[PDB]
Amino acid sequence: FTEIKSGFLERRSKFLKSYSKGYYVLTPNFLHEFKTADRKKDLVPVMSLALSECTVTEHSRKNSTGSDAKFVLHAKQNGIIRRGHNWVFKADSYESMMSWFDNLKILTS
Amino acid sequence: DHPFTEIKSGFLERRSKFLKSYSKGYYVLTPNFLHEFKTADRKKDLVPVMSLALSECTVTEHSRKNSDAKFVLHAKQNGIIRRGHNWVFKADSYESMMSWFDNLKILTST
Amino acid sequence: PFTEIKSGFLERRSKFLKSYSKGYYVLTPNFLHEFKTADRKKDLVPVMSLALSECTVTEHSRKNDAKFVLHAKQNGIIRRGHNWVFKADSYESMMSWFDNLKILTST
Amino acid sequence: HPFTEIKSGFLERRSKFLKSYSKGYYVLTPNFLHEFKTADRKKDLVPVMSLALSECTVTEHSRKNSDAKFVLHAKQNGIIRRGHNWVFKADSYESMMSWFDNLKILTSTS
Ligand SMILES: O=P(O)(O)O[C@H]1[C@H](O)[C@@H](O)[C@H](O)[C@H](O)[C@@H]1O
Ligand SMILES: O=P(O)(O)O[C@H]1[C@H](O)[C@@H](O)[C@H](O)[C@H](O)[C@@H]1O
Ligand SMILES: O=P(O)(O)O[C@H]1[C@H](O)[C@@H](O)[C@H](O)[C@H](O)[C@@H]1O
């Protein structure tokens, strides 16, 4: 229940070149993935990515100034992601993506 | 790897009821979870072994002072622990146990 | 990221004036805070923050009936040994407050 | 006897009217930076002030080389006027950074 942001995101597989969706919760410590949004019964994160090991590097530009709703989370250290690898996430709109990005930028700076 | 919203951290031993022995781990309490890590290296070892949602846990009994450094964490829902099942923790002292117990209790009242 | 246990309006009785005044309260693991209003973004300064570790809850109404008593164990906002009475809109709502408080303040 | 505290210690806050630092004992929780006159966590439990983190940010801090200061900025009118700034001083650079990084992660939406 104590969080900065939560909602669905699609995470890309580099090798498979496809996306899979999960329900994410950002807290001051972790980006957690859960299979669902039911916070009372779905209690065990699929994974918890420690923010202190991550940075957010790039994001999409708005189309007019999911195509424009991506951002990249970079691993600074070996954790869930191998050091100096990157995961790409896709939110429903540029606007929602920037909400994720702007929080993550502060948390990981 | 530098900041973390930790309310309490330290080593605890958790009794396994199948293995008949305690496993020690490095635990960190946040407002949302009691996380276990294999080690205390808060800069590098940052994938939890397990993360117990406080929203579905309670703390129920503990040792009387007079080891006397144990307490029970109970599951309200099916998670890491099956609904209605209980895990027993052992801290280094009664006093340390009560620091854990009181910090958990105030985060699991609902 | 607000960690709260419960929030809502309660009326707090004055023992001497024999009247109630209403406030918007927020129970956290550490305090029962009163605010003038429910607007969490603009009404930022607690009117008072009662430390739970200095309090117990002692009695409450039986169902017909929405009152409970918060007892000061030490001198804080309330004098040691003294009591404040709170009234919530229903027995059910009152028990929600009381049951949380009982756990938070139990020895 | 328990308290969800993420960080606590003495800080000096600069008053811009009094032209001096006032020292107080501060306790960070997930909701507030509270000031108390003393460190007596069992008896001195009415905050001097409680700064809502939802409407605070941390903005600058000292470069290593006092170098133990940081600025807390107000987003809204509260115990600081909106857009005004308070300067804190902690015993060392390292301790200042522990405060700064702990605040920063709790004030990313503010
Ligand atoms: O994020 P993943 O795990 O897909 O990491 C890849 C890096 O993304 C590439 O820069 C790099 O070129 C490598 O190919 C690497 O697999
Ligand atoms: O008195 P000590 O510190 O040896 O505590 C023991 C407990 O008494 C046992 O229940 C428990 O099963 C453990 O063996 C633990 O060692
Ligand atoms: O630690 P030192 O000796 O540098 O003391 C200074 C204070 O640190 C300043 O905040 C205050 O602004 C004064 O400039 C004062 O010089």
Numbering used by the authors:
A (entry chain C): 467 to 531, 538 to 581
B (entry chain A): 464 to 529, 539 to 582
C (entry chain D): 466 to 529, 540 to 582
D (entry chain B): 465 to 529, 539 to 583
Task: Provide the publication's sentences verbatim.
The results presented here include: (i) the apo structure of Slm1-PH that we resolved at 1.76 Å resolution; (ii) one structure with phosphoserine at 1.68 Å resolution; and (iii) two structures of Slm1-PH in complex with Ins(4)P at 1.4 and 1.8 Å resolution. Electron densities corresponding to the Ins(4)P molecules were visible between the β1-β2 and β5-β6 loop regions (difference density maps). For the two structures determined in complex with Ins(4)P, the positions of the inositol ring overlap. In both cases, the oxygen atoms of the inositol ring contact the β1-β2 region through the hydroxyl group of Tyr485 (hydrogen bond length  = 2.8 Å) and the NH2 group of Arg478 (hydrogen bond length  = 2.5 Å), and the β5-β6 loop through the ε-amino group of Lys542 (hydrogen bond length  = 2.7 Å). In addition, we observed a contact with the ε-amino group of Lys562 (hydrogen bond length  = 3.2 Å) from the β6-β7 strand. Interestingly, the two structures differ with respect to the orientation of the phosphate at position 4 (P4), which contacts either the β1-β2 loop or turns 180° and contacts the β5-β6 loop. In the first case, the main-chain nitrogen of Tyr485 and the carbonyl oxygen of Ser484 (hydrogen bond lengths  = 3.0 and 3.1 Å, respectively) of the β1-β2 loop region interact with P4, whereas in the other structure the main-chain nitrogen atom of Ser539 of the β5-β6 loop forms hydrogen bonds of 2.6 Å with the oxygen atom of P4. In the non-canonical binding site there are four residues that are consistently involved in ligand binding: Arg478, Tyr485, Lys542 and Lys562. The non-canonical binding site is shallow, large and solvent-exposed, and so the phosphate position of Ins(4)P in one of the structures was seen on the opposite side of the molecule. * Crystals of the same protein-ligand complex were obtained in different crystallization conditions.
